[PDB]
Design a binder for this molecule. Structure first.
Ligand SMILES: [Ca+2]
Length: 185
């Protein structure tokens, strides 16, 4: 009972990289996932430099709800940024992972998310914060949830390289080699 092999649809999802990048890397992640915090700092910048910058890979992120209410809030704020300020999306995304503490208990508040919006985006904190309260972008969260279930996501982050499921997100060798194999044929 693992993640299913197959190309996940990135239709309607946040993307970074050239439109015609031949390889799509998809992260199924969670803003409260400590491994996703590690992927963001340790692995993602290498994917950027080695592949995204040169147009080989486009990267996408799909929300997964494994850590309770804080995961939902963070997902909702994330969905709004992509919709309302796409060009700023990745600065907000990375700064949220960087704001994740190394402690267990809840930390995701509307106030924190609004403050990240303020510093990284065109979006007004009170606009976020109003939308979070009303759960305006719930449908985008449920869209991702449907996709997580279709792909049978068991743990975060789960990385896809085209139709290939990466066994270890923190093994950059596996990730680089799989991107390069996909790039060949
Ligand atoms: Ca999404």
């Amino acid at each position: 009972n693992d993640a299913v092999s197959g190309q996940p649809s990135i239709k309607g999802q946040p993307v970074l990289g050239k439109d015609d990048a031949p390889v799509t890397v998809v992260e199924f992640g969670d803003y409260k996932c400590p491994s996703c915090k590690v992927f963001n700092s340790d692995i993602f910048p290498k994917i950027q430099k080695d592949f995204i910058d040169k147009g080989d890979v486009k990267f996408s992120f799909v929300n997964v709800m494994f850590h309770g209410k804080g995961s939902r809030l963070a997902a909702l704020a994330s969905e709004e940024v992509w919709k309302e300020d796409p060009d700023s999306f990745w600065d907000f995304h990375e700064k949220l992972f960087e704001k994740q503490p190394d402690t267990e208990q809840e930390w995701v508040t509307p106030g924190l998310l609004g403050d990240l919006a303020k510093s990284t985006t065109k979006i007004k904190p009170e606009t976020l914060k109003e939308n979070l309260d009303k759960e305006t972008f719930a449908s985008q969260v449920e869209k991702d949830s449907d996709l997580n279930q279709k792909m049978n996501i068991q743990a975060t982050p789960t990385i896809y390289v085209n139709d290939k499921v990466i066994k270890n997100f923190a093994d950059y060798d596996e990730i680089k080699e799989t991107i390069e194999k996909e790039l060949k044929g």
